[PDB]
Design a protein around this ligand. Structure first.
Ligand SMILES: *c1ccc(C#N)cc1-c1cc(=O)c2c(F)cc(F)cc2[nH]1
Lengths: 13, 262
C-alpha cells in the first residue's frame, strides 16, 4: 500500500 | 425530457467515454471478442490441466511473491486509472491528499471490474490474451491456491450477465473513484457533489442503453458492495496464508499464471 500510494502520487503529477 | 440538463448529462457521459477509451487500451469489447472465439489470428491457447500446463510453457514465500508480481504487473493499470480520474471534472481540484485516498481504495475495485471482462464461466484470459486458464483447473489446485480465484469467477459471471458495455463501464468506474465513504477523507462534500452528478449521468445512460432492466441502476450499485467484498476477502486470504504450514509448493508456471491475475 505504501508502494501503491507512491505509484499514485507520481501518476497525479 | 431532452433539455439542457439532460444534454449536459449526455455530454458528461460522452466526455467520460472518450477519456476511458484513451486511458484503457484493452476494452471490454476486445476482451469479449477473444473469449467467444472471434479472433482467428494467434488464438489463445487453453491451459486446463497439468499436462497442458507443460505444453503451454513456450508462451520469499510463494504466496507473497505471487502477490508482489501481480502488483508490479498492475502498475500500468494503476497509472491508467489515475489518468482516467484526472479527466473526471472536478477531481484535480480536490485536496491532493483526498485524490490519493480515493485512488488508493478505488484501484483494487476497478481492477476486479476489468478482470471480470477477462472471465467467463469456463476460465480467464492470461498472458495479454495469449492464454486461457480454466476455472476448474484453478479450483483444483492445492490449498490454499485452489480458493484464490473462485470467488472472483462467481462475482464475474453475475456482473457479466448484466451486459454492460464500455460506455456503461466508464461512468460506473467514475462513480467508484468518487466514493465519499473512504476512510481518511477530509472534504467529503466536494467528492459527493461530483458523485451525485455522475450518478445522474449513470441513471440516464442506463435508461437509454438498457431497456430490458428496470432496476439495473440499483443492481449495478449493489455490485459495488460485492467488489469491496472481494477486496476484503484478500485480507482474509493473507491470514489463511500466515496460518498455513502445509506445503505451499506450486509449479513455477502456475506462479507465473497467478502473477497475471488479481
Ligand atoms: C495478485 C495476483 C493474484 C492474486 C490472487 N488470488 C492476488 C493478487 C493481489 C495482490 C494484492 O496486493 C491485492 C491488494 F493489495 C488488494 C486487493 F484487493 C487485491 C489484491 N490482489
Amino acid at each position: 500500500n505504501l508502494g501503491l500510494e507512491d505509484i499514485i502520487r507520481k501518476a497525479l503529477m | 425530457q431532452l433539455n439542457p440538463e439532460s444534454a449536459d448529462l449526455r455530454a458528461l457521459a460522452k466526455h467520460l467515454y472518450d477519456s476511458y477509451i484513451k486511458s484503457f487500451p484493452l476494452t471490454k469489447a476486445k476482451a469479449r471478442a477473444i473469449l467467444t472465439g472471434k479472433t482467428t489470428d494467434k488464438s489463445p491457447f487453453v491451459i486446463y490441466d497439468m499436462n497442458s500446463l507443460m505444453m503451454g510453457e513456450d508462451k520469499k514465500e510463494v504466496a507473497i511473491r505471487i502477490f508482489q508480481g501481480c502488483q508490479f504487473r498492475s502498475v500500468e493499470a494503476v497509472q491508467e486509472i489515475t489518468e482516467y480520474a484526472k479527466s473526471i471534472p472536478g477531481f484535480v481540484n480536490l485536496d491532493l491528499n483526498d485524490q490519493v485516498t480515493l485512488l488508493k481504495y478505488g484501484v483494487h475495485e476497478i481492477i476486479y471490474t476489468m478482470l471480470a471482462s477477462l472471465m467467463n464461466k469456463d476460465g480467464v484470459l492470461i498472458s495479454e490474451g495469449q492464454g486461457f486458464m480454466t476455472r476448474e483447473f484453478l479450483k483444483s489446485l492445492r490449498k490454499p491456491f485452489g480458493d484464490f480465484m473462485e470467488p472472483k469467477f462467481e462475482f464475474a459471471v453475475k456482473f457479466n450477465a448484466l451486459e454492460l458495455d464500455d460506455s456503461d463501464l466508464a461512468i460506473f468506474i467514475a462513480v467508484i473513484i468518487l466514493s465519499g465513504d473512504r476512510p481518511g477523507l477530509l472534504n467529503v462534500k466536494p467528492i459527493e457533489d461530483i458523485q451525485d452528478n455522475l450518478l445522474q449521468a449513470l441513471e440516464l445512460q442506463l435508461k437509454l442503453n438498457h431497456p430490458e432492466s428496470s432496476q439495473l441502476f440499483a443492481k449495478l450499485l449493489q455490485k459495488m458492495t460485492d467488489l469491496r467484498q472481494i477486496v476484503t476477502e484478500h485480507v482474509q486470504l493473507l491470514q489463511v496464508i500466515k496460518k498455513t504450514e502445509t506445503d505451499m509448493s506450486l509449479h513455477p508456471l502456475l506462479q507465473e499464471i497467478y502473477k497475471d491475475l488479481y
